[PDB]
Design an enzyme around this catalytic site. Structure first.
Site, PDB file in Angstrom:
ATOM      1  N   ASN A 204      -7.428  10.296  -5.850  1.00 27.44           N
ATOM      2  CA  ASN A 204      -8.066   9.607  -6.947  1.00 27.44           C
ATOM      3  C   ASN A 204      -8.870  10.556  -7.810  1.00 27.44           C
ATOM      4  O   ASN A 204      -9.183  11.663  -7.390  1.00 27.44           O
ATOM      5  CB  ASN A 204      -9.023   8.503  -6.419  1.00 27.44           C
ATOM      6  CG  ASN A 204      -8.248   7.481  -5.556  1.00 27.44           C
ATOM      7  OD1 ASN A 204      -7.324   6.846  -6.055  1.00 27.44           O
ATOM      8  ND2 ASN A 204      -8.562   7.386  -4.280  1.00 27.44           N
TER       9      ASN A 204
ATOM     10  N   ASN B  94      -9.333   4.965   2.647  1.00 28.24           N
ATOM     11  CA  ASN B  94     -10.016   5.864   1.672  1.00 28.24           C
ATOM     12  C   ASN B  94     -11.113   6.787   2.267  1.00 28.24           C
ATOM     13  O   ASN B  94     -11.852   6.422   3.194  1.00 28.24           O
ATOM     14  CB  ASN B  94     -10.610   4.978   0.595  1.00 28.24           C
ATOM     15  CG  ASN B  94     -11.295   5.753  -0.528  1.00 28.24           C
ATOM     16  OD1 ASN B  94     -12.482   6.011  -0.495  1.00 28.24           O
ATOM     17  ND2 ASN B  94     -10.493   6.179  -1.466  1.00 28.24           N
TER      18      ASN B  94
ATOM     19  N   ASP C 110     -11.884  10.098  -8.677  1.00 27.73           N
ATOM     20  CA  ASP C 110     -13.274  10.164  -8.181  1.00 27.73           C
ATOM     21  C   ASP C 110     -13.533  11.133  -7.045  1.00 27.73           C
ATOM     22  O   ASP C 110     -14.634  11.179  -6.547  1.00 27.73           O
ATOM     23  CB  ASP C 110     -13.799   8.758  -7.810  1.00 27.73           C
ATOM     24  CG  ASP C 110     -13.160   8.227  -6.542  1.00 27.73           C
ATOM     25  OD1 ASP C 110     -12.261   8.875  -6.013  1.00 27.73           O
ATOM     26  OD2 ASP C 110     -13.572   7.146  -6.085  1.00 27.73           O
TER      27      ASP C 110
ATOM     28  N   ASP D 229      -6.756   8.364  -0.671  1.00 25.31           N
ATOM     29  CA  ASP D 229      -6.226   7.293   0.241  1.00 25.31           C
ATOM     30  C   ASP D 229      -5.134   7.855   1.142  1.00 25.31           C
ATOM     31  O   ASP D 229      -4.215   8.556   0.697  1.00 25.31           O
ATOM     32  CB  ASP D 229      -5.673   6.185  -0.602  1.00 25.31           C
ATOM     33  CG  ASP D 229      -6.624   5.764  -1.661  1.00 25.31           C
ATOM     34  OD1 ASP D 229      -7.834   5.561  -1.340  1.00 25.31           O
ATOM     35  OD2 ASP D 229      -6.195   5.561  -2.805  1.00 25.31           O
TER      36      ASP D 229
ATOM     37  N   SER E 102     -12.041  11.118  -4.066  1.00 28.03           N
ATOM     38  CA  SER E 102     -11.558  10.577  -2.764  1.00 28.03           C
ATOM     39  C   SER E 102     -10.041  10.524  -2.783  1.00 28.03           C
ATOM     40  O   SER E 102      -9.398  10.501  -3.819  1.00 28.03           O
ATOM     41  CB  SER E 102     -12.059   9.159  -2.567  1.00 28.03           C
ATOM     42  OG  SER E 102     -11.593   8.193  -3.502  1.00 28.03           O
TER      43      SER E 102
ATOM     44  N   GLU F  37       0.801  -1.246   0.000  1.00 25.40           N
ATOM     45  CA  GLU F  37       0.000   0.000   0.000  1.00 25.40           C
ATOM     46  C   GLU F  37       0.811   1.262   0.000  1.00 25.40           C
ATOM     47  O   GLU F  37       0.575   2.203  -0.845  1.00 25.40           O
ATOM     48  CB  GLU F  37      -1.081   0.028   1.130  1.00 25.40           C
ATOM     49  CG  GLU F  37      -2.148  -1.012   0.889  1.00 25.40           C
ATOM     50  CD  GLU F  37      -3.119  -0.718  -0.227  1.00 25.40           C
ATOM     51  OE1 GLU F  37      -3.102   0.420  -0.760  1.00 25.40           O
ATOM     52  OE2 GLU F  37      -3.926  -1.618  -0.519  1.00 25.40           O
TER      53      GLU F  37
END
Ligand SMILES: [Pt+2]
Ligand SMILES: [Pt+2]
Ligand SMILES: [Pt+2]
Length: 128
Positions: A46, A59, A48, A52, A50, A35
């Protein structure tokens, strides 16, 4: 902070992840490695909307509130910035919530792809 493998294993063991919901400690070390490369400050924004956050790349649509993400549920009841600390406690506590809210470690793409079906005990072998 960028952890070492054995260092992070010890911290995760102190916070009770070994055999949490049946996942041995090496699973959790392996997930963090693929990760974030054991980097507590890792972020990935991201398309979209969001983001992380942190060593387990949690997220912001489901788990933490960053004020910038549509749809957010903040199920771990924390600001996302608390996941960017050198102290892993908030990330660990949230991860435990993620796995319990009926999700296995399949929630983590990196775990499903790079740890599932491998000897995860290698990630803690040689450590104390
Ligand atoms: Pt700690
Ligand atoms: Pt601790
Ligand atoms: Pt803890």
């Amino acid at each position: 902070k960028v952890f070492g493998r054995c260092e992070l294993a010890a911290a995760m063991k102190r916070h009770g992840l070994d055999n949490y919901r049946g996942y041995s400690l090496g699973n959790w070390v392996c997930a963090a490695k693929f990760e974030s490369n054991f980097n507590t400050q890792a972020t990935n924004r991201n398309t979209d909307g969001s983001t992380d956050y942190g060593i387990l790349q949690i997220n912001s649509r489901w788990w933490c509130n960053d004020g910038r993400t549509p749809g957010s549920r903040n199920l771990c009841n924390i600001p996302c910035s608390a996941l960017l600390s050198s102290d892993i406690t908030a990330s660990v506590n949230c991860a435990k919530k993620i796995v319990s809210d009926g999700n296995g470690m399949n929630a983590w793409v990196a775990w499903r792809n790079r740890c599932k079906g491998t000897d995860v005990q290698a990630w803690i072998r040689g450590c104390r």
